A and B are shown apart, each in its own frame.
With several copies, the nearest count.
Chain A
């Protein structure tokens, strides 16, 4: 139901934490880095840089209590934290 999604457009702190963790985990697995390399060998710094420029190719599936769900692209989500 992409029409009239009733969830918040902001980036929940839990969502931020889990997305950063998952992206860093993928980076540690020699995943294709989507942003320029500035010597940040650590995967988590690369993940934060990726999130800063909205270069993370992931979409969250927020589950409502009844069982439905809403798909929010990481790009559209507003990061204010």
Chain B
């Protein structure tokens, strides 16, 4: 129910200004804030204190403190995030990079 109330609440703020934003964009935001069975804020004490990739979490507002915790706990990062591939200068697994391209030898050799 709080998820519905949160949506009904933020909708008022945006609607009050006279601007209109689609249902999806507001719906996604409240859903992310309540996947943990609770209102996870977007502050350093909210979203940041999550289990997401350690390297991605460092860059938001707390960096040196975060690295120590990851280093002390021997945290392993899977590099499945966006920032990780940005830091390491690789193609992020998003958009055009969410898949892979293979050479079809069977079709290529077939097409003579």
Contacts and interface: CB of A to CB of B under 8 A. Distances in A.
A57 B99 contact: no
Interface string A14-48: 11011101100000000000100000000000000
Contact of A57 (B96, B97, B98, B107): B107
Contacts of B99: 14-15, 18, 60-63
A60 B100 contact: yes
Given A14-B95, A14-B96, A18-B96, A71 B102 contact: yes
Interface residues of A, number: 21
Majority secondary structure, A binding face: mixed
Contacts of B107: 57, 59, 73, 75
A61 B100 contact: yes
Interface of B: 93, 95-104, 107-108, 111
27 contacts: A14-B98, A14-B99, A15-B96, A15-B99, A18-B96, A18-B99, A18-B101, A57-B107, A57-B108, A57-B111, A58-B102, A58-B103, A58-B104, A59-B101, A59-B103, A59-B104, A59-B107, A60-B99, A60-B100, A60-B101, A60-B102, A61-B99, A61-B100, A61-B101, A63-B100, A73-B104, A73-B107
Interface of A: 14-15, 17-19, 21-22, 34, 55, 57-63, 69, 71, 73-75
Given A18-B96, A61-B102, 11 more contacts: A15-B99, A18-B99, A34-B111, A57-B103, A57-B108, A58-B103, A59-B104, A61-B99, A61-B100, A62-B99, A69-B100
User: What 7 pairs across the A-B complex have the smallest Cβ distances?
Assistant: A57-B108, A59-B104, A18-B96, A61-B100, A14-B96, A59-B102, A14-B95
